[PDB]
Amino acid sequence: PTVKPPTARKFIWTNHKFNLSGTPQQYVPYSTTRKKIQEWVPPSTPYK
Amino acid sequence: GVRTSPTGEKVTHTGQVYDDGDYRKVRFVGRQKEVNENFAIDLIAEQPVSQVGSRVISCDGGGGALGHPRVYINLDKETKTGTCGYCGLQFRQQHH
Amino acid sequence: QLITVDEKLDITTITGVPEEHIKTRKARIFVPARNNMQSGVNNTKKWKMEFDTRERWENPLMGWASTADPLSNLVLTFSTKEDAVAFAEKNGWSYDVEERKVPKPKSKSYGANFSWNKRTRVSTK
Amino acid sequence: ADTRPTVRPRNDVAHKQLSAFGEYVAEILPKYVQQVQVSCFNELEICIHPDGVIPVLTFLRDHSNAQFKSLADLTAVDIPTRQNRFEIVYNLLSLRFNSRIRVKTYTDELTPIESSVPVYKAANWYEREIWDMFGVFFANHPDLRRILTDYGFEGHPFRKDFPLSGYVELRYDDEVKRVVAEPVELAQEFRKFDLNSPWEAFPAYRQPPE
Amino acid sequence: ASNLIEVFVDGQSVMVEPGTTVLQACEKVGMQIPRFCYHERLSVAGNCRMCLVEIEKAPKVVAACAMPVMKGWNILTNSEKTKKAREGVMEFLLANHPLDCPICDQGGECDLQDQSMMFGSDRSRFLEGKRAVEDKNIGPLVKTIMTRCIQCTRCIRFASEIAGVDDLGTTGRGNDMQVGTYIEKMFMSELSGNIIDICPVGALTSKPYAFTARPWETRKTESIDVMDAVGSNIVVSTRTGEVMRILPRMHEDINEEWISDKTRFAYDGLKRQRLTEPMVRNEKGLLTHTTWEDALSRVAGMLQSFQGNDVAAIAGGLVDAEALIALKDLLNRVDSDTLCTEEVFPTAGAGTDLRSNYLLNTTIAGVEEADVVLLVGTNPRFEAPLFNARIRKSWLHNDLKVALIGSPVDLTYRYDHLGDSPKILQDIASGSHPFSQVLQEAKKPMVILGSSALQRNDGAAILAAVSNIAQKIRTSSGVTGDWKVMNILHRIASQVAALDLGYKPGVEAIQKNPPKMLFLLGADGGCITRQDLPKDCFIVYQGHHGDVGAPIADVILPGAAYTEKSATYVNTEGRAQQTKVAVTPPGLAREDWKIIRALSEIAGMTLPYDTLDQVRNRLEEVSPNLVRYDDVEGANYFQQASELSKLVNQQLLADPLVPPQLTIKDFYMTDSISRASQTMAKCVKAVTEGAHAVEEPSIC
Amino acid sequence: PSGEERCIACKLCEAVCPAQAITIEAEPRADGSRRTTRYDIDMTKCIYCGFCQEACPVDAIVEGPNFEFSTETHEELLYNKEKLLNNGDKWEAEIAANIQADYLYR
Amino acid sequence: STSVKPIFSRDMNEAKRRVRELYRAWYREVPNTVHLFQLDISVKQGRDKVREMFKKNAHITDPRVVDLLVIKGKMELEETIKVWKQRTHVMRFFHETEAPRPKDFLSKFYVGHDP
Amino acid sequence: RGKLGLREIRIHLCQRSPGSQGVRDFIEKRYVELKKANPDLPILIRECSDVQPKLWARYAFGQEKNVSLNNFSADQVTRALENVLSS
Numbered sequence A: 001p002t003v004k005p006p007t008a009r010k011f012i013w014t015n016h017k018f019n020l021s022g023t024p025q026q027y028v029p030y031s032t033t034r035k036k037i038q039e040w041v042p043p044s045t046p047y048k
Numbered sequence B: 001g002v003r004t005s006p007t008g009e010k011v012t013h014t015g016q017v018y019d020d021g022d023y024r025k026v027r028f029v030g031r032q033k034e035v036n037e038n039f040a041i042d043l044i045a046e047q048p049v050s051q052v053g054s055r056v057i058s059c060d061g062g063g064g065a066l067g068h069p070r071v072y073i074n075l076d077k078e079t080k081t082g083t084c085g086y087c088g089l090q091f092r093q094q095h096h
Numbered sequence C: 001q002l003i004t005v006d007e008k009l010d011i012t013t014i015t016g017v018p019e020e021h022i023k024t025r026k027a028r029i030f031v032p033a034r035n036n037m038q039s040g041v042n043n044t045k046k047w048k049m050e051f052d053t054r055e056r057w058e059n060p061l062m063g064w065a066s067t068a069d070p071l072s073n074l075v076l077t078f079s080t081k082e083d084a085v086a087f088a089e090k091n092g093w094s095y096d097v098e099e100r101k102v103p104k105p106k107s108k109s110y111g112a113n114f115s116w117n118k119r120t121r122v123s124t125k
Numbered sequence D: 001a002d003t004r005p006t007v008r009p010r011n012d013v014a015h016k017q018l019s020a021f022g023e024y025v026a027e028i029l030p031k032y033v034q035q036v037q038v039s040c041f042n043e044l045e046i047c048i049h050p051d052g053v054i055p056v057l058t059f060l061r062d063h064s065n066a067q068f069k070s071l072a073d074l075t076a077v078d079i080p081t082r083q084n085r086f087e088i089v090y091n092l093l094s095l096r097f098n099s100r101i102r103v104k105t106y107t108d109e110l111t112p113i114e115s116s117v118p119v120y121k122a123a124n125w126y127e128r129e130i131w132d133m134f135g136v137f138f139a140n141h142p143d144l145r146r147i148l149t150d151y152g153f154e155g156h157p158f159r160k161d162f163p164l165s166g167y168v169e170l171r172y173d174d175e176v177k178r179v180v181a182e183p184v185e186l187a188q189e190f191r192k193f194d195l196n197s198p199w200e201a202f203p204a205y206r207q208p209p210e
Numbered sequence E: 001a002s003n004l005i006e007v008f009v010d011g012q013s014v015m016v017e018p019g020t021t022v023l024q025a026c027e028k029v030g031m032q033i034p035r036f037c038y039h040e041r042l043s044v045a046g047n048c049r050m051c052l053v054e055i056e057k058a059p060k061v062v063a064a065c066a067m068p069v070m071k072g073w074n075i076l077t078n079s080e081k082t083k084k085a086r087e088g089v090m091e092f093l094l095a096n097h098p099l100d101c102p103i104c105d106q107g108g109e110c111d112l113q114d115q116s117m118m119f120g121s122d123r124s125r126f127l128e129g130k131r132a133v134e135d136k137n138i139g140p141l142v143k144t145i146m147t148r149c150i151q152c153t154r155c156i157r158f159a160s161e162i163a164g165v166d167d168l169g170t171t172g173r174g175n176d177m178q179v180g181t182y183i184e185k186m187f188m189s190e191l192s193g194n195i196i197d198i199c200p201v202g203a204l205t206s207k208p209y210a211f212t213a214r215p216w217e218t219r220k221t222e223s224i225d226v227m228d229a230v231g232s233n234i235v236v237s238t239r240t241g242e243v244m245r246i247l248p249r250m251h252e253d254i255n256e257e258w259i260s261d262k263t264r265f266a267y268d269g270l271k272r273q274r275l276t277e278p279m280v281r282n283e284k285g286l287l288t289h290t291t292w293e294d295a296l297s298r299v300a301g302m303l304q305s306f307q308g309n310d311v312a313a314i315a316g317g318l319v320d321a322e323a324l325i326a327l328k329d330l331l332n333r334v335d336s337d338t339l340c341t342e343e344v345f346p347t348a349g350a351g352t353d354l355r356s357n358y359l360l361n362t363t364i365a366g367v368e369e370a371d372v373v374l375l376v377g378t379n380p381r382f383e384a385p386l387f388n389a390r391i392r393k394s395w396l397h398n399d400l401k402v403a404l405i406g407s408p409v410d411l412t413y414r415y416d417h418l419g420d421s422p423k424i425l426q427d428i429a430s431g432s433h434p435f436s437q438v439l440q441e442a443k444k445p446m447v448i449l450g451s452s453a454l455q456r457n458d459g460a461a462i463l464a465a466v467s468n469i470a471q472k473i474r475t476s477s478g479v480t481g482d483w484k485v486m487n488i489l490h491r492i493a494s495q496v497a498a499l500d501l502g503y504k505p506g507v508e509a510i511q512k513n514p515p516k517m518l519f520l521l522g523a524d525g526g527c528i529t530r531q532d533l534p535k536d537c538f539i540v541y542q543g544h545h546g547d548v549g550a551p552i553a554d555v556i557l558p559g560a561a562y563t564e565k566s567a568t569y570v571n572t573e574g575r576a577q578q579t580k581v582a583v584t585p586p587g588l589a590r591e592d593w594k595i596i597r598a599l600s601e602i603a604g605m606t607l608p609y610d611t612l613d614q615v616r617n618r619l620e621e622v623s624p625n626l627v628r629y630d631d632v633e634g635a636n637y638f639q640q641a642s643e644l645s646k647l648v649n650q651q652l653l654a655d656p657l658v659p660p661q662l663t664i665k666d667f668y669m670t671d672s673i674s675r676a677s678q679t680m681a682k683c684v685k686a687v688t689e690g691a692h693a694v695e696e697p698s699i700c
Numbered sequence F: 001p002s003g004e005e006r007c008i009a010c011k012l013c014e015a016v017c018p019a020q021a022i023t024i025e026a027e028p029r030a031d032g033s034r035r036t037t038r039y040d041i042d043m044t045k046c047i048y049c050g051f052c053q054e055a056c057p058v059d060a061i062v063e064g065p066n067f068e069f070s071t072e073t074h075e076e077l078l079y080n081k082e083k084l085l086n087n088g089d090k091w092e093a094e095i096a097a098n099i100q101a102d103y104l105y106r
Numbered sequence G: 001s002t003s004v005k006p007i008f009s010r011d012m013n014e015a016k017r018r019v020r021e022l023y024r025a026w027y028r029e030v031p032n033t034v035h036l037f038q039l040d041i042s043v044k045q046g047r048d049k050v051r052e053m054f055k056k057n058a059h060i061t062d063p064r065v066v067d068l069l070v071i072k073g074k075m076e077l078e079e080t081i082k083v084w085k086q087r088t089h090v091m092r093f094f095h096e097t098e099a100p101r102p103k104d105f106l107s108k109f110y111v112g113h114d115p
Numbered sequence H: 001r002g003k004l005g006l007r008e009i010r011i012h013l014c015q016r017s018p019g020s021q022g023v024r025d026f027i028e029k030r031y032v033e034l035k036k037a038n039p040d041l042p043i044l045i046r047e048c049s050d051v052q053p054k055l056w057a058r059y060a061f062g063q064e065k066n067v068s069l070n071n072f073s074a075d076q077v078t079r080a081l082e083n084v085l086s087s
């Protein structure tokens, strides 16, 4: 890389991180979508 | 564009966050929720508009065969810029 | 050399399916409806058999679609309506048959677009 | 052999020779042969009544102009629309004449098929595989039993109506200290795709309207 | 017959009526000729040129879509000449087409993609730049990406001939020819969404469905629309247990292959305001989530304490038959017969005894045979969009005469406006009105009265007055005998099935005898509030949406929606059709009849059916036509019903006839599902506030 | 280069994936762009065949040069969109050079 | 037609014979199996299960369907006698981990949509 | 209230079948009298092809009894409806 440097992009990481498995920085999967069906919210109004 | 919810959890670029009472946010306790910090929407806004001098302009995203398929964009409308379907770059027709 | 067996042919006991998915399943026999987004008719040539849809839920971890139904993706293709019924009976599924819907032939005329006294005249081309 | 770089050339001498031998076999065993066809890529198939297996396989093995000494394979195909849903396929090889031939027959769930082990000892395990995966029973077979599926496995997986993931799945249970089978539940259901195009691709295979 | 002439198709003889085109002759031997501009339900255009085919001994190729066959032609649909014509034409189509397939919703279900694979070449020799076209904003429903347009002009023909709207046309000339409205206009119509389906390319796409799914990953569930009484056959597309879109399903006698925009774009209401868990009133007076055990125990505790008139029920507009029979049987075992519907149909005379009184006896397909049609107090364009489309088809192809009594609403086809007062019905009977002759001389007359008219306090009179006219026509030997004249056009998907089950139409019975316990089985109309009930009435609401009925109930039992159950509905013409489960009910919701069946067992009055087949064997007993699916029966005995009609004479009100729905704005939001939809909300805002008001990015 | 994601949610990778390892959902982004809201790879389903990168029209999904990413738990091998975006940010320097070296063969 | 090739039995009387024989071999076997496999069930529970399996197929009347049922039952026996199975396969008949599944309408109604 | 009070009648007949001729004849001639005779008694006539004619009566508390009308004459039917009423 000294002779042939890699192209510079602003989004590229500056600080390389090693395998973080088994540490408090490990990757935990999760769903990245929002709730599908919205539930009807009962009125706070009490009238009967 | 990484804002946090009132609970303390960061919101993702898709807008997802665990609501106040969801138990599934326990999976992050003692660990971390991975959120990419470079929001594609905010980065593609920063790009300047490209003033051009023809009615039709073609974008391939750059790099020739390392970009996206080549698309021809119409710039007749004055009220708005012309945007690339693939890469999101904007174009305008010059002084016209 | 040969024997004479007359009873209704049934094989539910030897096929190996559980009872839960023989008795409570409602097979559906039909010709698929043409996808209206296209004009091709090559997918409306054969009879299909499918079963009733059952519950799918979100996987708690990744949000995927989880199923407990082992027949959800099962689809069978038959040449004729009898074959689909013949297969469904010997496997002991309750079924419903929907008759094929054939496009009604139509009278098309180009000259009809330029009519002296009729409302079929077209105002544009 | 033509200057069409991308199109497979036709060998017409092979097509003629295979058609001549198809008649020869049909002339000699008319009691059993129901159809003879040679494909465009030169492959002869003889369709026979299920009762002619041993006479047909024996004739092809032992005749001085057949000499199909080698059973290359033996398998079944499931076509649920047919009344005899199972089609049994025999692929044979002749080293004397450097030729191959396919013999096909049919059966149903409740019709046995004569074992060919008397003709080809290679068929012993092939028929166990056919029984296990397709549930087609072979009569007079020295030792018919499952060969691929797990012990106590209910069903015949290679039938078109057997679900892809089956009905039961195994895990280990701590409480009973053994591997337990349970009804299958997938965290992600297999996603079925409808890929068939609504436009006809091959007019040469168009079937006559109802 | 001797009409038929003989033609050959690749040497295969077929006998065809004279005037059949080459493209139709090929369809009889099972072949499909490629096409882009031809559609069997539109006028022939002949401009795309993809249908070009060779006739043996004919030097030139002919447009198969527009060429009548002549005796003794051999159509060569697979000759070298035919194939090369197709390859040439496909090359021209793809020359200026954009490279959008990855970003184009049409990808994977595109006739240009698929016919390019089958009949086009594998490579391009086009070495120039391509055309680019600006996009038009023709409303909040159809997204336009007109660079993809191939100028087949299908959309233009559909709007002109099917929707009766002339907003779309071609401006310009040559390669610059563009499709659009020229001005800033929105092609807003009850049938507007249909131009998406007929457009063979991604030029016109659904805005609500944009980007969300691909064709190959969606499972197709054949079901029925319940947004109106026409019973349009649809396809519910689902992916991973989620409803993605609604497509039409071809039914020749019902909706052909169209649907209304409420049918097409109201499915997003199923994703909002959903009732997902049973709710009961806490001590403080608010509704709280609770288990099915607590909820049903309360309802069963009250149900047993009452008898007879005390227990009443109202059936909403989207309720299925299985629930209707289940609820009825439950209230029978407490000796109640106050089984009501929100819709009002006069009970005078025969009433619901004879099906002919409240059915569309001519059938939807029949309108194509009528020669005169009388519409009374009904806006068929909005109450039954697909019925009015059938009217325009006959008005256009058969020269149907249409007359209307009621407001001067726009039907998209010119009609004779007899007037607005109900008294005009009296005149037609006497013969004073000049129109009375047209009905007399007409061989196959048809009279349509809309259920919206019968909601007037004088509804009994109007039905009798209109039935008076139909009786005159049939008596005179002008009619063919087996032709039926009197027709009722319904607007509620559950009205006909309820009537066939002995329900009492309207909420007059409840007002006559206010109940102690009331079941609102999906009733969101607002007909019965708490002003109209005793002080402590025990309302129990069962439905799939929280809107008007739920907020006032004591116990809410969440139910399924039409996309989530295999239920039976009967359309205005009497045809019984069944939905299928596409996705299951959300959360704790349960199928409607199972809720009532469970309520019985906790009540003690256990019902005699515990599966869907058994509850459908019960429907056979009550009315044997509720299990004949896709079959129209027929109701005779108009003579008998007419006689009972005159026994009591009532006075027509002096009020003019005005349909509830007068403009497009009143069509989008008419029920709980469509009121929840946000596509409909943007449609209402678009037509009212203004066209330009709605404008969104449409980059791709 | 600007920083916008290359993926346009065409789902060609999901359709081709022999192992059905990819799950995609999409919608119109706040600026009307065609972008995914869910992109997941079950790395325990994947066979590392590289059909998905062959099928992608915009070089959005790639198989990188990293082969040392073994984990201690199964859950750490179910990648969502954030993880794969972070891998792209982490390894772009090398990935781009490898594409530069082989794109002419492709 | 109704003329069909037979597997073994040419009528139900012969078929019921082989059924009867196969039950003898299973009835004798359970005492051995409960020992060789070191099962935790009593020989009574084992023999009841063999009775249960034979009972579920009572209605069958086709001679050919019965032949195959016997053929399959013998293959099952051959695996257990020759100890080709393992302790796990033999105990799969008893479903000792599957929790009680209700069969009354209200119970199925509370839990889920399954019919 | 009262007990065993007839709450409803239902007559199911075919439209073209031979064995439904009596039931059809009854409707044409006698039904109008019946309805006037019993103004508030729901009498539900439901035609469907290839049904076997039947008479369904629902009493108080959801008790139903069915009476076949197959191959009955009009007067034969009139007795049945007479029998149902007043019971």
Ligand code: SF4
Binding pocket: E097, E098, E099, E100, E101, E102, E104, E105, E106, E107, E108, E110, E111, E112, E113, E148, E200, E201, E202, E203
């Ligand atoms: S309409 Fe869309 S999918 Fe069809 S060829 Fe054009 S860009 Fe591709």
Ligand code: SF4
Binding pocket: E148, E149, E150, E151, E152, E153, E154, E155, E156, E179, E198, E199, E200, E201, E203, E204
């Ligand atoms: S917009 Fe679509 S339907 Fe209309 S002319 Fe263009 S391609 Fe044809």
Ligand code: SF4
Binding pocket: F016, F017, F018, F019, F020, F021, F022, F041, F045, F046, F047, F048, F049, F050, F051, F052, F053, F063
């Ligand atoms: S490399 Fe993995 S994710 Fe990509 S197509 Fe192959 S199996 Fe699917």
Ligand code: SF4
Binding pocket: E102, F006, F007, F008, F009, F010, F011, F012, F013, F014, F024, F055, F056, F057, F058, F059, F060, F061
């Ligand atoms: S990664 Fe590529 S192939 Fe997959 S959806 Fe995105 S753009 Fe399409």
Ligand code: FES
Binding pocket: E034, E035, E036, E037, E038, E045, E046, E047, E048, E049, E050, E051, E052, E063, E064, E065, E066
């Ligand atoms: S289909 Fe004939 S020219 Fe278009």
Ligand SMILES: [K+]
Binding pocket: E106, E195, E196, E197, E198, E199, E200, E201, E202, E203, E204, E205
């Ligand atoms: K389209």
Ligand SMILES: [Zn+2]
Binding pocket: B059, B060, B061, B068, B084, B085, B086, B087, B088, B089
């Ligand atoms: Zn670009």
